Ligand binder design. Structure first.
Ligand SMILES: *[C@@H]1O[C@H](CO)[C@@H](O)[C@H](O)[C@H]1NC(C)=O
Ligand SMILES: *[C@@H]1O[C@H](CO)[C@@H](O)[C@H](O)[C@H]1NC(C)=O
Lengths: 231, 221, 221
């Protein structure tokens, strides 16, 4: 039915681990096609190419656009605007976007395997929880030793909003299943989280067999020459 | 503009808690209609009193109630529709699932980095490896069941193995530090179709993360 | 020496395990005619079945009245009624039943094994104790790991009334005997209790080898 125009933030995986940074601005409710060419208030190379539209419920057309090169305006704190001229409305429709403020940084925790899984000796599982961050975009990757595991080895849920104790924050989880022989050989596994509010955009926590439910605390302290003309 | 038919399995919150379990056939059109159910069951249904969706065709539903024992008994249900815009009647059907699997539930203790700020401790519940993807999760404190507005549970994704198809789901609950240091206990419950007694429970308190022995030695040499 | 009529309740195993519900109405005593007219005052269509020709002592002919489908009306608060009239007893009589109020939730403990047999290394006992619930209807089941043990590997007493201050609460016990190799190896067990005052119909406690922590500190000069 009637058209409606929306704006979309740049993807998180391209700002952290990438080079290019494309914004995008779509408009649904287009009948077949139109002569809409968009307007963007910083216009340094506005290669706003649209391409073939997509089909909706019972057959409809929706066309969009992009704009490249958005690292330094998006992180420095610029502003953007998208608007297009089209038939099926009175006034041409507009939209604006800005990098958010009033953010929080995530608290990352890596939990050891439960004690019951260790006796069966088939596989174990390691849980990675991130908690209390204000925008809802995150990245979770795993490492074994120092080598990154491929994406199809683990499972990550989505970011959701947790019950309120003040400001509104979010959370996420992930699990990885590894062979129970390697847990006793002494390998290490570690979890990485990438978020906007962190200082260098990534942080990590690490766990192996000794650190984390050890059933053993051994510590030796040797203090050598306590009466020893300290200068 | 376009016709469509569906069925739906009865919801798990009604199959497990209070047995009044419905079974829904929808039709999305009329851009007047009669439905027919092949198991007799005596009690007839009620038609939808026909809301609209997606800016378009107003759908119409009809619900056959009182079918909680033939669902678990292994019976089969089909519902047959009719409409002016339909050339033939449409039919579809639904059965109970076969070759189920039961879940494995774990409750993990809070990380020790968290106890140093004196605000709130975090408990984590995980359930893994069950074949039909429908599940329930409920938390407790002692015996008092907590209201649902106090925790957060995720959906039920599919986990990456090569053997079969299995699923998993998580949940967190943040309780106060003063109640944690007193020795209050907390529990996590999971409900599944494939469990024999329909519920399983795990609990925790401020012990059971503490280590079993500590060896310190100070050498003045 | 002649009985009068009264009315029983549904079985808790059937009412909790999701299957069905019945309701029984009985008189007996003498081998007389089959004009035992059982009549139910509320009846949603499917009325009762005049039951099997059961016998009791000196030919005391018992037949009963049993109706299916009694979960939702019993649970939300109806008030059922049974009336009867006999060829000998042509003077009719009636009884009533009602789901109770004034409920309390149970408290379940599991207790570790008995140092005397902890040294003997032959067999160990685990005792489950429930206490303080309002009707005299419970279930007890035992588990190991995630697997349910059969009902022949333990014993359970009946629920006696406990004497204490003011109100009438109840209690019941059960014991389980298991060999020592898996008990010292680290296998775990569970005790479950079903009761109609709990909001999710069940609770469950588990036990395993509750010890304190060791601390060794040594100074070497
Ligand atoms: C952004 O647009 C909204 C309406 O779409 C308007 O209310 C708001 O003032 C705009 N903000 C700026 C900074 O232009
Ligand atoms: C009923 O369900 C079966 C699968 O159980 C399917 O193969 C069939 O197409 C369905 N419809 C019928 C028999 O009309």
């Amino acid at each position: 039915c009637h058209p409606r125009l929306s704006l979309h933030r740049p993807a998180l995986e391209d700002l952290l681990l990438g080079s290019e940074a494309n914004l995008t601005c779509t408009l649904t409710g287009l009948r077949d096609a139109s002569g809409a060419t968009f307007t963007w208030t910083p216009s340094s190379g506005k290669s706003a190419v649209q391409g073939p539209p997509e089909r909706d419920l019972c057959g409809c057309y929706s066309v969009s656009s992009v704009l490249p090169g958005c690292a330094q305006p998006w992180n420095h704190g610029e502003t953007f605007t998208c608007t297009a001229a089209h038939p099926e409305l009175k006034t041409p429709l507009t939209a604006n976007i800005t990098k958010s403020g009033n953010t929080f940084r995530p608290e990352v925790h890596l939990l050891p395997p439960p004690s019951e899984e260790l006796a069966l000796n088939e596989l174990v599982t390691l849980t990675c929880l991130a908690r209390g961050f204000s925008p809802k975009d995150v990245l979770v990757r795993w490492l074994q030793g120092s080598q990154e595991l491929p994406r199809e080895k683990y499972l990550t849920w989505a970011s959701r909003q947790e019950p309120s104790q003040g400001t509104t924050t979010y959370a996420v989880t992930s699990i990885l299943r590894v062979a129970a022989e390697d847990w006793k050989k002494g390998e290490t596994f570690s979890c990485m989280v990438g978020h906007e509010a962190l200082p260098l955009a990534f942080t990590q926590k690490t766990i192996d067999r000794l650190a984390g439910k050890p059933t053993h605390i051994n510590v030796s302290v040797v203090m050598a020459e306590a009466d020893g003309t300290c200068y």
